[PDB]
Scaffold this active site. Sequence first.
Site, PDB file in Angstrom:
ATOM      1  N   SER A 142      36.896  27.635 -24.661  1.00 13.09           N
ATOM      2  CA  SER A 142      36.680  27.239 -26.045  1.00 13.09           C
ATOM      3  C   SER A 142      37.908  27.718 -26.853  1.00 13.09           C
ATOM      4  O   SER A 142      38.591  28.654 -26.445  1.00 13.09           O
ATOM      5  CB  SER A 142      35.420  27.913 -26.615  1.00 13.09           C
ATOM      6  OG  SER A 142      35.414  27.843 -28.047  1.00 13.09           O
ATOM      7  N   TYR A 155      30.333  35.585 -29.615  1.00 14.98           N
ATOM      8  CA  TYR A 155      30.796  34.384 -28.966  1.00 14.98           C
ATOM      9  C   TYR A 155      32.290  34.456 -28.726  1.00 14.98           C
ATOM     10  O   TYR A 155      32.782  34.078 -27.653  1.00 14.98           O
ATOM     11  CB  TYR A 155      30.468  33.158 -29.816  1.00 14.98           C
ATOM     12  CG  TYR A 155      30.798  31.848 -29.169  1.00 14.98           C
ATOM     13  CD1 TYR A 155      29.972  31.315 -28.180  1.00 14.98           C
ATOM     14  CD2 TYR A 155      31.923  31.128 -29.541  1.00 14.98           C
ATOM     15  CE1 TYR A 155      30.253  30.089 -27.586  1.00 14.98           C
ATOM     16  CE2 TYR A 155      32.226  29.899 -28.944  1.00 14.98           C
ATOM     17  CZ  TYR A 155      31.378  29.388 -27.962  1.00 14.98           C
ATOM     18  OH  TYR A 155      31.643  28.150 -27.386  1.00 14.98           O
TER      19      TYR A 155
HETATM   20  N1  LIG Z   1      30.079  22.294 -28.601  1.00 15.83           N
HETATM   21  C1  LIG Z   1      31.159  22.904 -29.075  1.00 15.83           C
HETATM   22  O1  LIG Z   1      31.523  22.812 -30.248  1.00 15.83           O
HETATM   23  C2  LIG Z   1      31.980  23.697 -28.034  1.00 15.83           C
HETATM   24  C3  LIG Z   1      33.350  23.919 -28.240  1.00 15.83           C
HETATM   25  C4  LIG Z   1      34.113  24.611 -27.290  1.00 15.83           C
HETATM   26  C5  LIG Z   1      33.514  25.079 -26.116  1.00 15.83           C
HETATM   27  N2  LIG Z   1      32.142  24.864 -25.893  1.00 15.83           N
HETATM   28  C6  LIG Z   1      31.520  25.357 -24.644  1.00 15.83           C
HETATM   29  O2  LIG Z   1      31.200  24.165 -23.862  1.00 15.83           O
HETATM   30  C7  LIG Z   1      30.242  24.607 -22.843  1.00 15.83           C
HETATM   31  C8  LIG Z   1      29.057  23.581 -22.775  1.00 15.83           C
HETATM   32  O3  LIG Z   1      28.115  23.616 -23.921  1.00 15.83           O
HETATM   33  P1  LIG Z   1      27.795  22.331 -24.889  1.00 15.83           P
HETATM   34  O4  LIG Z   1      28.458  22.449 -26.164  1.00 15.83           O
HETATM   35  O5  LIG Z   1      28.040  21.086 -24.152  1.00 15.83           O
HETATM   36  O6  LIG Z   1      26.286  22.679 -25.298  1.00 15.83           O
HETATM   37  P2  LIG Z   1      24.943  21.970 -24.746  1.00 15.83           P
HETATM   38  O7  LIG Z   1      23.803  22.824 -25.057  1.00 15.83           O
HETATM   39  O8  LIG Z   1      24.952  20.540 -25.142  1.00 15.83           O
HETATM   40  O9  LIG Z   1      25.140  22.067 -23.191  1.00 15.83           O
HETATM   41  C9  LIG Z   1      24.919  23.309 -22.553  1.00 15.83           C
HETATM   42  C10 LIG Z   1      24.092  23.140 -21.295  1.00 15.83           C
HETATM   43  O10 LIG Z   1      23.978  24.462 -20.724  1.00 15.83           O
HETATM   44  C11 LIG Z   1      22.624  24.587 -20.229  1.00 15.83           C
HETATM   45  N3  LIG Z   1      22.225  25.994 -20.178  1.00 15.83           N
HETATM   46  C12 LIG Z   1      22.283  26.862 -21.208  1.00 15.83           C
HETATM   47  N4  LIG Z   1      21.893  28.077 -20.797  1.00 15.83           N
HETATM   48  C13 LIG Z   1      21.553  27.975 -19.496  1.00 15.83           C
HETATM   49  C14 LIG Z   1      21.046  28.878 -18.555  1.00 15.83           C
HETATM   50  N5  LIG Z   1      20.802  30.143 -18.870  1.00 15.83           N
HETATM   51  N6  LIG Z   1      20.837  28.418 -17.294  1.00 15.83           N
HETATM   52  C15 LIG Z   1      21.081  27.150 -16.979  1.00 15.83           C
HETATM   53  N7  LIG Z   1      21.546  26.258 -17.854  1.00 15.83           N
HETATM   54  C16 LIG Z   1      21.782  26.646 -19.109  1.00 15.83           C
HETATM   55  C17 LIG Z   1      21.827  23.897 -21.303  1.00 15.83           C
HETATM   56  O11 LIG Z   1      20.522  23.591 -20.763  1.00 15.83           O
HETATM   57  C18 LIG Z   1      22.678  22.646 -21.592  1.00 15.83           C
HETATM   58  O12 LIG Z   1      22.353  21.543 -20.710  1.00 15.83           O
HETATM   59  C19 LIG Z   1      29.774  26.027 -23.253  1.00 15.83           C
HETATM   60  O13 LIG Z   1      30.466  27.033 -22.469  1.00 15.83           O
HETATM   61  C20 LIG Z   1      30.200  26.118 -24.711  1.00 15.83           C
HETATM   62  O14 LIG Z   1      30.402  27.483 -25.045  1.00 15.83           O
HETATM   63  C21 LIG Z   1      31.382  24.172 -26.872  1.00 15.83           C
HETATM   64  O1  LIG Z   2      34.824  24.593 -38.284  1.00 11.38           O
HETATM   65  C1  LIG Z   2      34.542  24.892 -36.980  1.00 11.38           C
HETATM   66  C2  LIG Z   2      35.554  25.031 -36.030  1.00 11.38           C
HETATM   67  C3  LIG Z   2      35.250  25.330 -34.696  1.00 11.38           C
HETATM   68  C4  LIG Z   2      33.918  25.496 -34.278  1.00 11.38           C
HETATM   69  C5  LIG Z   2      33.584  25.797 -32.944  1.00 11.38           C
HETATM   70  C6  LIG Z   2      32.251  25.957 -32.520  1.00 11.38           C
HETATM   71  C7  LIG Z   2      31.936  26.259 -31.197  1.00 11.38           C
HETATM   72  C8  LIG Z   2      32.950  26.406 -30.270  1.00 11.38           C
HETATM   73  O2  LIG Z   2      32.676  26.693 -28.981  1.00 11.38           O
HETATM   74  C9  LIG Z   2      34.265  26.250 -30.661  1.00 11.38           C
HETATM   75  C10 LIG Z   2      34.578  25.945 -31.981  1.00 11.38           C
HETATM   76  C11 LIG Z   2      32.916  25.352 -35.253  1.00 11.38           C
HETATM   77  C12 LIG Z   2      33.222  25.051 -36.580  1.00 11.38           C
END
Ligand SMILES: NC(=O)c1ccc[n+]([C@@H]2O[C@H](COP(=O)([O-])OP(=O)(O)OC[C@H]3O[C@@H](n4cnc5c(N)ncnc54)[C@H](O)[C@@H]3O)[C@@H](O)[C@H]2O)c1
Ligand SMILES: Oc1ccc(-c2ccc(O)cc2)cc1
Lengths: 275, 268, 275, 268
Positions: A142, A155
């Site tokens: 991330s 986080y």
């Molecule tokens: N969404 C954002 O803005 C963003 C940005 C950067 C990085 N990320 C990272 O991307 C990755 C994916 O998350 P996402 O945003 O697609 O969210 P999401 O909730 O849509 O997907 C996450 C998935 O992880 C599964 N999960 C969560 N906890 C679990 C557990 N304990 N055991 C098994 N499965 C579990 C959930 O059931 C879900 O299907 C994460 O590492 C998140 O930190 C997200």
């Molecule tokens: O304005 C913002 C910018 C980055 C995130 C962000 C949230 C989750 C994550 O995994 C990374 C970036 C949220 C709000």
Amino acid sequence: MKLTGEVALITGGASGLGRALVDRFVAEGARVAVLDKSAERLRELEVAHGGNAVGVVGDVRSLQDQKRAAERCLAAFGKIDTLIPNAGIWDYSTALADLPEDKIDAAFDDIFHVNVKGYIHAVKACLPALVSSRGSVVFTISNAGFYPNGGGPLYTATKHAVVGLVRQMAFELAPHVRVNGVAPGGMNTDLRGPSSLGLSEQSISSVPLADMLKSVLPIGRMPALEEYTGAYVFFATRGDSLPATGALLNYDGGMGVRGFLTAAGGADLPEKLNI
Amino acid sequence: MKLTGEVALITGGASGLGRALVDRFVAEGARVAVLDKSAERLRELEVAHGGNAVGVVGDVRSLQDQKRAAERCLAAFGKIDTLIPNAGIWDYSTALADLPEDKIDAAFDDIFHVNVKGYIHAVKACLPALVSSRGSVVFTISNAGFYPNGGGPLYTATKHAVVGLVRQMAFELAPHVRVNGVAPGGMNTDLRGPSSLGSVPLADMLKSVLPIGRMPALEEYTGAYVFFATRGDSLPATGALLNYDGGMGVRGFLTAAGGADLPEKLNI
Amino acid sequence: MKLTGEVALITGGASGLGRALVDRFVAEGARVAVLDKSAERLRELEVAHGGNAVGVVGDVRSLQDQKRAAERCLAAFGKIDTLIPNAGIWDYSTALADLPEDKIDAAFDDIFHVNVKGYIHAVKACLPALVSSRGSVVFTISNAGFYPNGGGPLYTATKHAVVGLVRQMAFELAPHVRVNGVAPGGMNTDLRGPSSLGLSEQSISSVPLADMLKSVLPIGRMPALEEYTGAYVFFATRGDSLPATGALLNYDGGMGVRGFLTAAGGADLPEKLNI
Amino acid sequence: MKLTGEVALITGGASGLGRALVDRFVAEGARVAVLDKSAERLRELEVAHGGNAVGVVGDVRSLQDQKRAAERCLAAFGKIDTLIPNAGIWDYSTALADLPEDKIDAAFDDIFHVNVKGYIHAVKACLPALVSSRGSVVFTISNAGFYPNGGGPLYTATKHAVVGLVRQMAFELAPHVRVNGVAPGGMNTDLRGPSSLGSVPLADMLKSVLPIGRMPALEEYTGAYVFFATRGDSLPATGALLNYDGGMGVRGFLTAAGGADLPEKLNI
Ligand SMILES: NC(=O)c1ccc[n+]([C@@H]2O[C@H](COP(=O)([O-])OP(=O)(O)OC[C@H]3O[C@@H](n4cnc5c(N)ncnc54)[C@H](O)[C@@H]3O)[C@@H](O)[C@H]2O)c1
Ligand SMILES: Oc1ccc(-c2ccc(O)cc2)cc1
Ligand SMILES: NC(=O)c1ccc[n+]([C@@H]2O[C@H](COP(=O)([O-])OP(=O)(O)OC[C@H]3O[C@@H](n4cnc5c(N)ncnc54)[C@H](O)[C@@H]3O)[C@@H](O)[C@H]2O)c1
Ligand SMILES: NC(=O)c1ccc[n+]([C@@H]2O[C@H](COP(=O)([O-])OP(=O)(O)OC[C@H]3O[C@@H](n4cnc5c(N)ncnc54)[C@H](O)[C@@H]3O)[C@@H](O)[C@H]2O)c1
Ligand SMILES: NC(=O)c1ccc[n+]([C@@H]2O[C@H](COP(=O)([O-])OP(=O)(O)OC[C@H]3O[C@@H](n4cnc5c(N)ncnc54)[C@H](O)[C@@H]3O)[C@@H](O)[C@H]2O)c1
Ligand SMILES: Oc1ccc(-c2ccc(O)cc2)cc1
């Protein structure tokens, strides 16, 4: 198709980025095992991709569940080429000042067990398959792994921890298994927060992520989920990424190269250059 | 004396670098509160420094203990200018492959609770005092916050996590509290590891590790912290990361140092 | 006084940050040789610090001039403990699109000769003294060594180049000479640009630097020049910085840890925490 | 084929990695223009690929030559989607102490003009075409853009300078042109150095250098560039820095790789 014959195990692949990756990987000719806690979503994904995807219900916090996932992937597809530890939860950018004293210990354990321990357990469980296949690990990090304000202390600390996992594991698993990181930035997913902070029924799609980011991203727009799957395809293509280990790809729209007074420096280029 | 009138709170200060820090800070005219689990060594530092140090026996994993340290420091000294969250435990460089399946979840909790949570709790406990004083936080990191092979996955991840605490808390506590990290490395001290667990001496591998070609005494790592504690000297610094490790990150491929023969080359 | 008995050579020490460092170093009991092109300013600084400072007129682009500086420092003070290569010029954040085709080659040579070659030449010239004293080098970098929009391509490239000098020279000069970097961020100095771009008679004090930075710096205010001298004092104190080599100190008010929608996250802390 | 219909302009493309890139890009269905000083090798690549490659003989230090390449690519192919500034020269790892005083100023100009200025001129020449196409720039960096002992001060500074071009041009050319860096390292090719000048083979020191434990063919470094050239796959990426060097930055202290004995440990 870039990934014909390859087999990936993706944790958190029942939705969000993980699901987009499942869809993308299959469309590229990969077979995919998914470890996830949502049984419902896992079956939908199995029927979406008949024979090319297998779901296993489990918790990334459980080493035994992780091992089952690996066993199941082996049983269905015979190998594991690429592990993508990806499951995660957010803290909704809850500031240290705003974490209640009586919840912080629980919130810490939740977010770190999922975000860091779940990654360690995934690698541990898949290590025999990966050494066997001379495979790779590609961690979902991330922008919170590099810069602040993408999450609160918890986080941001977990995603920096994951950068450490990239480095240490690239070292430890060398020369047989490659270990790299993709750090995406801003995705309309179903991302949850800890029940401890009353956020376990709160999804990130419910936040105006795209609009907050409009004047923060040098690229101008928050990419769709499909547009984030390519970097992973790349690392999963054996012939394309062989020299890569310890690599960290910031894949966030330019968050680390934004300007002081504006995100981008070249709004005026088209007219400035006469087309 | 550059820290006359200032108050520091140091976690893990009854031994190793933390004890070097206490001593140095007291010698610079600071008054120091110390949270540590070791009652004997707290008393030992207390007799060493008279009323210029106060010890509080407690666990960095405990937010209540961290509040008691904060409260004790305020009672004793009236303010807290600089917080040094420093207590940490090692993992013996236990590789993932070598972490037993029946030990791994407990090891994880132990090392993260101390190394990451105890840092979060220190800041949380000291936040009112630090904002009141327009103070500073200086986290003890490590080379393992930046490069591999300074510990196993558990320790390396914990120290990378504190780089993340540097960055996030620098943002969150601005503009009033400055937050920076010192990343020590050339050291040689009994850094303890978890009960759930249990490598080459640094001396045995020095020329593969440290371009500085020597192993600094613990005293030699206290300067960076004094600097960050010195309001007149470090005012611009927030979010800074000071690699303080004898050049581990800039070491050569075949040997750590590239200039053994410069004295002969330049005739001196 | 932290630096009693120490001797520093500072390039660009006739004004700006270099002069503040001259003043600071002397007040800490150091003796200082200054290499600079302004003969006038060098004499003012000599009389300001009778016996503790010696100016040498020269051009940091000339190895021979640099060598003279080193010779002169040796002659007056007997050793060199700390070299601070510091002389530099700006490009006034002139964007690549805005660099005229017929000036760019000249502008490149000017800014790189001063900003990078001048640093190499300083180290080269002082290398016998530094090995002799078991001394150190502390380079003046900039936030333009780490992030964009602190300069156009030329300046940003020169200050990134200097980061490379920190790393390579810490390696090469090890174990006898330590090499570190201070990267300050925003200083009301007399900083010039290249005559090639018509900026050689343009000083940075003439720019509203402080006010542009007000909502960019997490610390809230652009520090005075005196407030930037401490980091250098620190690296120049032998007993305080012995473990330091290859170190890069970002010393810029928090430019690398600023938030997305605001610079700082804790405006409200005082009232939030009840004093 | 992932680059069907796309046009690349590659500097330094008549040999080494640049020639591997030309070949790979052509095999992916791209059409490529190449600026290089070597007429013979340009002709050689031209016969290899028919009308899918065009060579222009010129010097990357020359903005006029870079404009001619740009103009030639537009005439031949109608657009420029991806620019790969790639030409660079080495310094033989000549240490500062070893740079002769009567050679140093000339060496400096030669290596900076090629390695840094030729990158600036490529972008400058191609800027109208790249903005028109909402295109990409992918700079060839090196491990020497990140860690020491990959060249001398002159080469290491030049490659750190290109990291700076990545960051600044990503900012300046946003939101229309994406700018990223590939930092290759495990290689083994005749990287030429300056006339003003003149080390251990990589093979001789491999286990001290590369955790991947092998020396990739040049073909194996072209994937990263294809990725950045692929609009559907790399749209989020700008300002990115891809260390592509066999793990040089994550190598161990005593040996590069930490896992030689994993197959025995895990029984396979
Ligand atoms: N969404 C954002 O803005 C963003 C940005 C950067 C990085 N990320 C990272 O991307 C990755 C994916 O998350 P996402 O945003 O697609 O969210 P999401 O909730 O849509 O997907 C996450 C998935 O992880 C599964 N999960 C969560 N906890 C679990 C557990 N304990 N055991 C098994 N499965 C579990 C959930 O059931 C879900 O299907 C994460 O590492 C998140 O930190 C997200
Ligand atoms: O304005 C913002 C910018 C980055 C995130 C962000 C949230 C989750 C994550 O995994 C990374 C970036 C949220 C709000
Ligand atoms: N020593 C090295 O080789 C080295 C190198 C780089 C970084 N570091 C870091 O240096 C910092 C401190 O190292 P040190 O030299 O002081 O090590 P040390 O083990 O000698 O001292 C650690 C101190 O922390 C205290 N402590 C440990 N757990 C505690 C707990 N749960 N509650 C309260 N107090 C506790 C111990 O009583 C001890 O006083 C740590 O963050 C460590 O990870 C050490
Ligand atoms: N001012 C800022 O905003 C800022 C911010 C970060 C870093 N820096 C860096 O700080 C350093 C000092 O510059 P400053 O801002 O104090 O500007 P300044 O002009 O006030 O001081 C620079 C000094 O360098 C001398 N000098 C310039 N070229 C020379 C040459 N060829 N030979 C000999 N002497 C020469 C000048 O005569 C002057 O005394 C530079 O490396 C600059 O890049 C400046
Ligand atoms: N080969 C390695 O060991 C290694 C490792 C990391 C990074 N790199 C970088 O890889 C990139 C290219 O390396 P390569 O393998 O292609 O090296 P190479 O020396 O085999 O090829 C370089 C090409 O650049 C051309 N060239 C050189 N100077 C020129 C000039 N002034 N004008 C026009 N053309 C010129 C040469 O004709 C040649 O075609 C460079 O930026 C280099 O610094 C190389
Ligand atoms: O060396 C330099 C010169 C100018 C800036 C600068 C930063 C922010 C800004 O708004 C203007 C100038 C930074 C470093």
